[PDB]
Amino acid sequence: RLLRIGNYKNTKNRIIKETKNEAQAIAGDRIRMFIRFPKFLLEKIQDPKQLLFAVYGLLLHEHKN
RNA sequence: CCGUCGCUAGUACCGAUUGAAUGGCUUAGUGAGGCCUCAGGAUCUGCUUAGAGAAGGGGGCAACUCCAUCUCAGAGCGGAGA
Numbered sequence: 001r002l003l004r005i006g007n008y009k010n011t012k013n014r015i016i017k018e019t020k021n022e023a024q025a026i027a028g029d030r031i032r033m034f035i036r037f038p039k040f041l042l043e044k045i046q047d048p049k050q051l052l053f054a055v056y057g058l059l060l061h062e063h064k065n
Numbered sequence: 066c067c068g069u070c071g072c073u074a075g076u077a078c079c080g081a082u083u084g085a086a087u088g089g090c091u092u093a094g095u096g097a098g099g100c101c102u103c104a105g106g107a108u109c110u111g112c113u114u115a116g117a118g119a120a121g122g123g124g125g126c127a128a129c130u131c132c133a134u135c136u137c138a139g140a141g142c143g144g145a146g147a
Contacts, residue, residue: 007073007074010073010074013074014074
């Protein structure tokens, strides 16, 4: 039940090419982002000028083992 | 003996093109600017010469006449000159 990618380097570079193809809003922009976020994790929403709160984007199937 | 088969990406290429950008020549045309020159004369100014007003002096002495000093405008001859 594992994700079997054949060659890491070439598929990695190709998916980076796909990501650069699919860059919907470029670096240097300001975004009102709506992220899917459950109710119970609102208890850790801190003062954003008081706690650092960074947002990092992911790629295709970096979630699969 | 590593020579075909089709795929996987990496390495040199053509130039037939388009889109700009740079430079070298070359044809023709346009051609800013200062300088010299033909002019032009906003303006100022110098002398004279008149006309008209004021102050003084000398004289028929009654107005009036003569001479010196300014002011306002003309006419010439000049110079400078945007």
